Amino acid sequence: GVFNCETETTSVIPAARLFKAFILDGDNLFPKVAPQAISSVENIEGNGGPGTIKKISFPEGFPFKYVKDRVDEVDHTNFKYNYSVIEGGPIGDTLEKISNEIKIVATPDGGSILKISNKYHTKGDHEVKAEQVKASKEMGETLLRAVESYLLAHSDAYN
Template sequence: MGVFTYETEVVTKIPAAKLFNAVILDGDTLLPKIIPQAIKDVELIEGNGGPGSIKKITFGEGYQFKYVKHKVEAVDKENLSYSYSVIEGDALMNNALEKIVYETKVSPSPSGVGSICKSTSKYYTIGEFEIKEEQIKAGKDKSSALYKAIEAYLLANPDAY
């Protein structure tokens, strides 16, 4: 088994606490609303949304994957951090991956305007499977597009969150 890790950093005009509230605390409701072509539905299967909870994310028509289930590992509202593991679904590439762990931290921008969202993705492979560079780039591009869609929504709706 190998572990492939990559990091993504997205800078937004949205204050850190507001971005965390929108993406992490209310993301299950907000994301299907603003990007239904990517995320059709988020269903809480087990738990209350906190650590140990299991969620099923159903993706939109034509999306690369049909669904994933993820387990919430940690939610730290004070430090604006969140982590979860993908434990089931076609994103695990027909069992070529044991799991995928995502850790996200939102911080105020050093300039005092907006925030920086840093994400670490760890892919736990089974056997000799390797993550290709184009797969990493595609993941980073999707992450960036997700944050830009959220930023656009929050800028258009300044009273939200």
């Protein structure tokens, strides 16, 4: 089956700056701001753009050890990041892939919203494990808030 979750999350950080930090420099920034959540990010194949395979490792004590993501598209004009979760983490049993999009949209107040879509491909009749959707939400919100906190403390970062 196919299951799609589209969510919106508010950030006080302006869209362009958040896109630079959260998306463009995620590999370097995530282990810096959220070391307790992300151990490392490394490129398995490629540089960082379309086709690139990256391994994101988590610290011991988490439900998962790692995920492999494939970079699908990085739209700098529309602040849009498309990627797929293709190995590790929740991939296994009845879940084959998660196809993700993160779009960072400026808001009238000078802040931003992250428009996030997670498209799950499950085996035939099977449904998405509810604990994964929830844990994915927690991991994402954790990273965002850690990025936010860093940016607010470092006005010179990602100008």
